[PDB]
Write a protein that binds this ligand. Structure first.
Ligand SMILES: CN(C)C[C@@H](CO)Nc1ncnc2[nH]ccc12
Ligand SMILES: [Cl-]
Length: 167
C-alpha cells in the first residue's frame, strides 16, 4: 500500500492520472520523481523547467555541478540526484527528443531506467515538448517498466485520449 490516490490502473504495475507532476510530488513526496531531462541537465521547459522552478533552482545548481564533474548523460540514460523539496530522489531520464532528430527506439532504453526503482512518480517520456507520440510513449512504458509506476499526464484532453485509446 502506498499514498498515491485517484489513479486509474492500466496493468499490474502501471497507473495513470490527469495531474500536474509538480503538485503531485509536493503532495505525495514520493521516494522517486522522474524528470524528463536532457543530456546537459538544462531544466528550461516542460516537466524539467517546472520541477526545477518548484525547487527554487536548487535542482539546476545541483545539476550543473553534476555535469561539470561527469559530463553529459546519454540519450536513453539517467542519473539519480536529490529530490529536493519534491521527493527523496529525482531520477533524471533522457528520452529521445524528436525535435532534435533523435532515434525513437531509444525510448525503450530510457524507460528501462525505471526498473532500478521499486516505485516511481513519472511523466510520459519523450512526450510534450520532446515531440513524440504520447500514445506510443504510454505503450512503451507499459511494455518496458516492470516496477510500479504512477504516471502524471498534465493535459486533461490528452489524458482522456490516452485512457480511451489504451489497449
Ligand atoms: C504537457 N504534456 C503534453 C507533456 C508532459 C510530458 O509528457 N508534460 C508534463 N507532464 C506532467 N506534468 C507536467 N508538469 C509540467 C509539464 C508536465
Ligand atoms: Cl512537456
Amino acid at each position: 500500500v502506498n499514498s498515491f490516490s485517484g489513479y486509474l490502473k492500466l496493468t499490474d504495475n502501471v497507473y495513470i492520472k490527469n495531474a500536474d507532476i509538480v503538485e503531485e510530488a509536493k503532495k505525495v513526496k514520493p521516494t522517486v520523481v522522474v524528470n524528463a531531462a536532457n543530456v546537459y541537465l538544462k531544466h528550461g521547459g516542460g516537466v524539467a523547467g517546472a520541477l526545477n522552478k518548484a525547487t527554487n533552482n536548487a535542482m539546476q545548481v545541483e545539476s550543473d555541478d553534476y555535469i561539470a564533474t561527469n559530463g553529459p548523460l546519454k540519450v536513453g540514460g539517467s542519473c539519480v540526484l536529490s529530490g529536493h523539496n519534491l521527493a527523496k530522489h529525482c531520477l533524471h531520464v533522457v528520452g529521445p527528443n524528436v525535435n532534435k532528430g533523435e532515434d525513437i527506439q531509444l525510448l525503450k532504453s530510457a524507460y528501462e531506467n525505471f526498473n532500478q526503482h521499486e516505485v516511481l512518480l513519472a511523466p510520459l517520456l519523450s512526450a510534450g515538448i520532446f515531440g513524440a507520440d504520447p500514445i506510443h510513449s504510454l505503450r512503451v512504458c507499459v511494455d518496458t517498466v516492470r516496477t510500479n509506476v504512477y504516471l502524471a499526464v498534465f493535459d486533461k484532453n490528452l489524458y482522456d485520449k490516452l485512457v480511451s485509446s489504451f489497449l
